[PDB]
Amino acid sequence: AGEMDRDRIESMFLESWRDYSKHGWGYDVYGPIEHTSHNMPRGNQPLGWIIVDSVDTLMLMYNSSTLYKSEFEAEIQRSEHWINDVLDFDIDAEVNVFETTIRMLGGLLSAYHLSDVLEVGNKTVYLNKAIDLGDRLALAFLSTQTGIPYSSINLHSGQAVKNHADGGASSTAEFTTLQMEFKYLAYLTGNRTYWELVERVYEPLYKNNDLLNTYDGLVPIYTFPDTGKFGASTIRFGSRGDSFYEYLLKQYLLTHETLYYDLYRKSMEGMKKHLLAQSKPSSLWYIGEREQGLQGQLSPKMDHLVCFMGGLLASGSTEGLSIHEARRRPFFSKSDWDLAKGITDTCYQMYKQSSSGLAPEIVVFNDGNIKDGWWRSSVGDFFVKPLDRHNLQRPETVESIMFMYHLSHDHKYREWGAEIATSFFENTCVDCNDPKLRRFTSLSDCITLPTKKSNNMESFWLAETLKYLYILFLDEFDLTKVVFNTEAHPFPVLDEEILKSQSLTTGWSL
Numbered sequence: 001a002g003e004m005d006r007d008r009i010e011s012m013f014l015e016s017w018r019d020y021s022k023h024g025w026g027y028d029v030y031g032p033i034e035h036t037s038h039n040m041p042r043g044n045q046p047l048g049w050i051i052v053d054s055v056d057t058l059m060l061m062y063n064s065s066t067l068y069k070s071e072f073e074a075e076i077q078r079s080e081h082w083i084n085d086v087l088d089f090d091i092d093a094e095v096n097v098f099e100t101t102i103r104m105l106g107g108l109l110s111a112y113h114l115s116d117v118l119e120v121g122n123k124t125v126y127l128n129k130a131i132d133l134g135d136r137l138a139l140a141f142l143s144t145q146t147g148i149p150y151s152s153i154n155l156h157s158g159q160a161v162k163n164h165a166d167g168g169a170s171s172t173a174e175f176t177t178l179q180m181e182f183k184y185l186a187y188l189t190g191n192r193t194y195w196e197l198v199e200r201v202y203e204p205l206y207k208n209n210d211l212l213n214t215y216d217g218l219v220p221i222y223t224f225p226d227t228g229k230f231g232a233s234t235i236r237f238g239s240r241g242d243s244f245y246e247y248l249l250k251q252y253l254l255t256h257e258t259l260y261y262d263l264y265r266k267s268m269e270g271m272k273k274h275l276l277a278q279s280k281p282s283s284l285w286y287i288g289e290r291e292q293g294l295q296g297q298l299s300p301k302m303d304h305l306v307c308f309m310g311g312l313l314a315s316g317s318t319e320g321l322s323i324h325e326a327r328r329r330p331f332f333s334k335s336d337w338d339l340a341k342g343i344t345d346t347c348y349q350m351y352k353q354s355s356s357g358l359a360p361e362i363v364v365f366n367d368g369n370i371k372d373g374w375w376r377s378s379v380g381d382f383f384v385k386p387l388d389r390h391n392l393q394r395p396e397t398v399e400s401i402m403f404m405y406h407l408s409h410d411h412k413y414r415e416w417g418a419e420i421a422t423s424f425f426e427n428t429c430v431d432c433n434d435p436k437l438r439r440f441t442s443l444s445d446c447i448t449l450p451t452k453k454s455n456n457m458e459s460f461w462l463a464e465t466l467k468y469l470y471i472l473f474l475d476e477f478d479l480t481k482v483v484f485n486t487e488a489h490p491f492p493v494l495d496e497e498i499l500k501s502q503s504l505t506t507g508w509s510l
């Protein structure tokens with residue numbers, strides 16, 4: 001029953017939310033096991049890490065809840081008042097530009113959007129907060145000549161600070177996963193500066209590295225901000241690389257700027273050419289890594305983070321349309337669609353073949369060359385290294401499952417989603433038999449049974465994992481009218497004509 005699994009997912013969310021609100025209200029970091037909490041800034045001022053990241057999930061559930069609508073409404077109010085009255089981003093502390101942009105700036109923007117379209121709360125509260133934070137973060141683009149920002153910035157002074165390690169290089173995905181957020185902010189404010197600054201990073205990236213010709217659109221994970229040149233590093237769709245590809249497509253879906261689709265196409269073909277492979281014995285499609293350039297060997301290691309590719313590929317091929325209607329359009333990519341189904345299956349298998357039914361942080365697919373103390377999956381398609389056995393309540397697989405279900409309408413995806421939701425329920429719960437004290441937490445080990453719990457609840461458990469599971473069981477969700485930022489914060493597809501009138505156009509080319 002769709003509405004039933006809906007009640008269940010809403011219940012799981014509320015159990016986590018009730019516990020968080022009771023013990024760690026207003027804190028950035030929260031541990032459900034010991035009910036402990038703290039803020040990230042050295043000064044102990046809150047960033048709204050969990051509250052801001054969760055507001056839009058509260059709004060989505062409020063909009064369709066039949067059993068807890070009233071509770072969700074009250075929590076939105078609680079969150080909104082706190083965001084307006086307590087949260088203050090004028091903090092003398094250095095924060096990571098990427099994380100703060102995708103979680104806080106993005107969450108405030110989507111809260112504004114849903115508040116607007118769902119007519120709940122005061123959208124102005126979120127927009128005003130977004131403008132102020134956006135201005136603090138935007139200062140990061142004034143540090144180098146290339147326009148590529150250093151990893152962190154002080155929210156009060158505006159002073160930028162380079163990455164501590166990696167020879168001072170910035171992570172490629174970190175400055176190429178800020179575009180949806182700043183462009184939507186430009187759209188809402190009419191302030192072109194946000195748009196101009198965030199689009200600026202691509203030219204040096206592509207030009208200075210001969211990215212298309214030399215790398216076939218595949219990016220090493222580190223880029224020096226002052227030169228715009230890649231640092232000797234791994235090429236992977238996992239951490240520090242993943243969302244660079246994500247936002248190439250999502251910008252096109254959001255603003256209709258074709259250049260980014262063209263760039264996206266180039267990277268996808270490059271990915272199929274250099275990183276794609278199949279495991280044994282199930283022939284599951286997976287995306288590997290190239291630690292030593294494209295000329296080196298292909299590593300079968302894959303971050304759970306890569307699993308978002310199922311949804312991305314499906315979204316890019318259909319542009320949000322049901323396959324039924326998409327299959328007849330000129331822009332439909334049969335290749336991308338088939339691979340989307342393939343990668344989503346593979347990622348589902350990472351749960352299905354797991355002893356706990358939950359996929360670990362990282363897996364190593366079987367390429368017939370796994371010839372020590374590694375754990376083998378049920379079928380043997382992949383292994384799990386002793387140090388990668390943790391599960392941080394990540395959303396990437398349920399993310400892709402949601403897209404596949406709504407675009408294909410194949411009920412098999414809702415079945416998969418249900419199994420994973422149940423595995424999270426049974427294997428990450430604390431006080432599992434008491435709905436009054438029950439809550440959910442991360443795992444230090446999701447391979448051993450019973451699973452070993454870690455005292456921490458990721459904000460994305462609420463912002464993404466439960467959100468995508470919830471949307472999966474919504475009977476109607478038009479993917480042609482929304483584009484999710486990388487933290488599952490939905491933005492509306494922008495009107496081309498309005499963008500034109502605001503002088504928001506592609507300021508570079510290739």
Ligand SMILES: *[C@@H]1O[C@H](CO)[C@@H](O[C@H]2O[C@H](CO)[C@@H](O[C@@H]3O[C@H](CO[C@H]4O[C@H](CO[C@H]5O[C@H](CO)[C@@H](O)[C@H](O)[C@@H]5O)[C@@H](O)[C@H](O[C@H]5O[C@H](CO)[C@@H](O)[C@H](O)[C@@H]5O)[C@@H]4O)[C@@H](O)[C@H](O[C@H]4O[C@H](CO)[C@@H](O)[C@H](O)[C@@H]4O)[C@@H]3O)[C@H](O)[C@H]2NC(C)=O)[C@H](O)[C@H]1NC(C)=O
Nearest residue numbers: 059060061062063064114117118474475476477478482490
């Ligand atoms: C948050 O929740 C809200 C709901 O609470 C949700 O908003 C929408 O949810 C549904 C999305 O699928 C949507 O229902 C679909 O509506 C289709 C369009 O036809 C119907 O809506 C028309 C437009 O409604 C707006 O304008 C109305 C004034 O014109 C206004 O009164 C209304 O409040 C909306 O603002 C409306 O004009 C149509 O009217 C015709 O039909 C009436 C009878 O229903 C008749 O009385 C009228 O004279 C006229 O002939 C019509 O009501 C509809 O095509 C679609 O049908 C499909 O869905 C069924 C589901 O059972 C399937 O069997 C099959 O697929 C079928 O084809 C479906 O009913 C709601 O109307 C929206 N609600 C509101 C109030 O906006 C929102 O999406 C959600 N947000 C999120 C992200 O969670």
Ligand SMILES: *[C@@H]1O[C@H](CO)[C@@H](O[C@@H]2O[C@H](CO)[C@@H](O[C@@H]3O[C@H](CO[C@H]4O[C@H](CO)[C@@H](O)[C@H](O)[C@@H]4O)[C@@H](O)[C@H](O[C@H]4O[C@H](CO)[C@@H](O)[C@H](O)[C@@H]4O)[C@@H]3O)[C@H](O)[C@H]2NC(C)=O)[C@H](O)[C@H]1NC(C)=O
Nearest residue numbers: 134135136137138139140141142157158191192193194197
């Ligand atoms: C569209 O959106 C953009 C992006 O956010 C906005 O641009 C920002 O605009 C503000 C204000 O115009 C800029 O901030 C101001 O910068 C001035 C110049 O900075 C130089 O001097 C400081 C020394 O203090 C150096 O640290 C810095 O490196 C530069 O050399 C400052 O002089 C201003 O300071 C004054 O205001 C602050 C406010 O708290 C006071 O504390 C100070 O004492 C002083 O009175 C101020 O900081 C900001 O740089 C712009 N950001 C970017 C990325 O461009 C647009 O304003 C907005 N609307 C428009 C016009 O399109």
Ligand SMILES: *[C@@H]1O[C@H](CO)[C@@H](O)[C@H](O)[C@H]1NC(C)=O
Nearest residue numbers: 084121122123124125126128
């Ligand atoms: C909405 O919030 C804005 C900013 O806090 C405030 O100025 C406005 O009065 C609020 N609207 C109302 C009256 O609810």
Ligand SMILES: OC[C@H]1NC[C@@H](O)[C@@H](O)[C@@H]1O
Nearest residue numbers: 243394395396460486487
């Ligand atoms: O796995 C989730 C966590 N890291 C990856 C990000 O893109 C976002 O999904 C969240 O911050």
Ligand SMILES: [Ca+2]
Nearest residue numbers: 308486487488
């Ligand atoms: Ca993501």
